[PDB]
Amino acid sequence: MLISQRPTLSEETVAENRSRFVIEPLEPGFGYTLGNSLRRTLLSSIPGAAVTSIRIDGVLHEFTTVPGVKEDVTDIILNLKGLVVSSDDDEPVTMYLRKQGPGVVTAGDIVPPAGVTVHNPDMHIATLNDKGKLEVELVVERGRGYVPAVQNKASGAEIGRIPVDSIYSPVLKVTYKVEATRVEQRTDFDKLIIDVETKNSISPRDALASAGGTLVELFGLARELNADSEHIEIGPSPA
């Protein structure tokens, strides 16, 4: 049992961190099968490092404003949520950001420990006023997907630790759609258009490759139930 003809995968680079992939021609009905699975794998199956909590020096109960900085605590948390961090620790680590005097303080001012890398130093963090100071510690750890704010409800022994939603996945926004196409004088075939936006950490092509490898490994479990059984193959593209 052989497929009618082999599909192909192509890419077009919209921007530096965004790209659109076209898979076609697929057998009718398989576009929807591939699309949602690929989107979910891309979003929630690529491990990455992100900030999972922060602590601001000088403020521990009034989480509305901090002296010496013209940005609310919410603005600082939102800015820190956007930091791009790559790590190989597998254990939470602590990073420090210390600044004094008026002016802008950015991510580049941070001093990562060994094994931690920052990919967007230019990211704006805060702006201090006259006599203002900013001393903030960040907790960085690795994970998968988007994990909402893990609170300190049962861990009250730590004071001032602000939990923050962590976007572990390097891929940010993924969308997909399926279009009808005609091949061999019949108009039933499906073309899958999947648009992927990713962080500065990795290129979209590598993220798509990782998602494909993960899905292949996952379905290897089903394939292992009974090999050599009937199954439509795809065949080699060049030969």
């Binding site: 989480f63 919410t74 956007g82 909402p148 939603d165």
Partner: protein, 586 residues
């Protein structure tokens, strides 16, 4: 675009297909190509798919009450026997997919193809020529979708919580992508209030002045307190449009589309309506709207109203027995009592239904239906008409949910039969008036740009009123809008607002209102002094295109058709041959 069945397309394009086949050596001569097409050999479809490209085809749905009943579409081959029609143009064609059929016509000459491609293309006929109100806009399901997406409900999962002591803000997201990720995980709802840092959506004018008084640009992050659904809805509108942050009722959607057409090119309008259609269908698929008899709620107050009004009717009957009433006045009093009872039951039903019930949600969003139908379905049918045409004093208490009894059903059938017989005779006089109107205005055309006349008519935009605060006149939309100022607007504020020749649009009227000027002289077709026909300046902008009318426009036919199309919606003199003359009861 439009879908055209393969066999239909082949039959229409036969000669072109034969020419192409002969050109490609598939057939040696004309006769061979004709035989190949008639036998429908495999080589025919490949040629048909290519020849049909970029060949407009006119679609018509009779009766053609107005010019939008014939529209050009770009055909695409589809297997089957049914023509695929775009959901938006249905209102223009006034057709539903329950057996209606369309006629297809093929232009041949280059002039005809250009005419269909430019003048009659569907994408260029969004607005109604009668009044300029958008006609290809979201309808039914789409309205239920975009509405459900933009609704705000308290207590939703992931709702924003105000910060307190040892409690920071929770419902805050760095970007819409994070909100999408949270929603996909079940931690957030598309209709839950949140605060999101938007960077690609232009903030509203007041917020823009507050934060970006020197001008907002893409990449300038601003925190917006809104729902994820509203953010997604605003992503469909053009990037230069200010943020809306409002529930998308039918009127709100109409206002947004009308404003978009006023400011942006028509192509942007077509793309925006396509995007809105797609989003509305997607979000109506999973809006939770469904019909069940657990959802058809019967108010508990209905019985009390019925009992009280039955007591009042008994009192009326008793007074009639006393001789204080004659038959006709007794019937009139009973009819008034029961109409009041029906109104009260309807009000109770309206105030009883929860806002989230599908039956009332469909009506309230403007998708379709009206509260009278809801009252009939769950309240009480009320009074019904006898064949003579007078209300029967005894109404129908039972609701269709409960089920009408035998006698109630029989008396109800009278009005149904009467209306089904009346619906066809209703169009006779409308067509008569339309053909009068077109005959008189058959040959009124715009022949020149300007007649250089200083005359006009006086119109009023608003009125100060008792408190002195200016209130807009409800007749300004159809009276002052789309006109050309006869004289400079210098009567107030000691300075000009807009000089002669300025076409009064939405921005122009808005500016005039802020200047505290009420009365203005505008050129009118009545005062035009053109030798033959009328002139472009006096006529004003063409409601279909939104710009100054073009020379050669057939103004007379458009005016006649616009007047005659809604004729069936008006009240009409009685059709009963037997009875009394209806002139007195005007």
């Amino acid at each position: 675009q439009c879908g055209l069945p393969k066999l239909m397309a082949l039959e229409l394009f036969k000669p072109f297909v034969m020419k192409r086949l002969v050109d490609l050596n598939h057939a040696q001569n004309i006769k061979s190509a004709k035989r190949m097409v008639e036998r429908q050999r495999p080589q025919v479809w490949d040629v048909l798919e290519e020849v049909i490209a970029e060949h407009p085809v006119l679609l018509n749905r009779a009766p053609t009450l107005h010019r939008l009943g014939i529209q050009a579409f770009e055909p695409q081959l589809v297997e089957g026997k049914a023509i695929q029609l775009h959901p938006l143009v249905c209102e223009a064609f006034n057709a539903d997919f329950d057996g209606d059929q369309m006629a297809v016509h093929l232009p041949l000459s280059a002039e005809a193809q250009a005419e269909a491609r430019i003048l009659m293309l569907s994408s260029n006929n969004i607005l109604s020529p009668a009044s300029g109100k958008p006609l290809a806009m979201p309808r039914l399901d789409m309205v239920t979708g975009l509405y459900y997406l933009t609704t705000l409900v308290e207590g939703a999962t992931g709702e924003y919580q105000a910060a307190t002591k040892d409690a920071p803000e929770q419902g805050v997201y760095s970007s819409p992508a994070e909100a999408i990720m949270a929603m996909d995980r079940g931690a957030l709802s598309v209709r839950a209030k949140i605060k999101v840092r938007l960077t690609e959506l232009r903030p509203p004018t007041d917020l823009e002045a507050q934060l970006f008084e020197n001008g907002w640009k893409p990449g300038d992050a601003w925190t917006a307190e809104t729902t994820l659904g509203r953010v997604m809805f605003n992503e469909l509108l053009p990037k230069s449009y200010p943020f809306v942050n409002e529930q998308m009722h039918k009127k709100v959607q109409a206002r947004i589309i009308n404003d978009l057409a006023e400011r942006f090119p028509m192509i942007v309008v077509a793309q925006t309506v396509d995007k809105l259609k797609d989003a509305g269908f997607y979000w109506a698929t999973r809006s939770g709207v469904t019909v069940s008899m657990a959802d058809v709620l019967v108010p508990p107050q209905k019985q009390e109203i019925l009992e009280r009004h039955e007591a009042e009717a008994d009192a009326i009957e008793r007074k009639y027995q006393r001789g204080a009433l004659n038959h006709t006045e007794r019937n009139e009093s009973l009819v008034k009592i029961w109409q009041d009872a029906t109104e009260e039951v309807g009000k109770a039903l309206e105030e009883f239904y929860p806002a989230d019930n599908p039956i009332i949600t469909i009506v309230k969003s403007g998708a379709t239906g009206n509260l009278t139908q809801t009252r009939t379905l769950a309240g009480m049918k009320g009074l019904v008409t006898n064949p003579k045409g007078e209300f029967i004093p005894r109404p129908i208490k039972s609701s269709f949910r409960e089920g009408l009894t035998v006698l109630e059903y029989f008396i109800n059938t009278h009005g149904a039969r009467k209306g089904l017989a009346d619906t066809a005779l209703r169009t006779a006089d409308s067509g008569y008036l339309t053909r009068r109107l077109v005959d008189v205005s058959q040959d009124v055309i715009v022949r020149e740009h300007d007649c250089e006349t200083e005359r006009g008519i006086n119109v009023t935009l608003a009125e100060r009123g008792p408190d002195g605060t200016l209130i807009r006149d409800a007749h300004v939309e159809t009276s002052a809008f789309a006109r050309t100022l006869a004289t400079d607007a210098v009567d107030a504020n000691g300075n000009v607002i807009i000089e002669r020749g300025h076409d009064l649009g939405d921005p122009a009227i808005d500016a005039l209102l802020a200047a505290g000027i009420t009365t203005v002289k505008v050129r009118s077709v009545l005062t035009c002094t053109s030798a033959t026909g009328v002139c472009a300046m006096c006529y004003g902008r063409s409601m279909a295109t939104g710009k100054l009318v073009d020379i050669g426009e057939a103004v007379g036919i458009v005016a006649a058709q616009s007047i005659g199309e809604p004729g069936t919606q008006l009240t009409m003199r009685t059709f009963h041959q037997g009875g009394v003359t209806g002139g007195a009861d005007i």
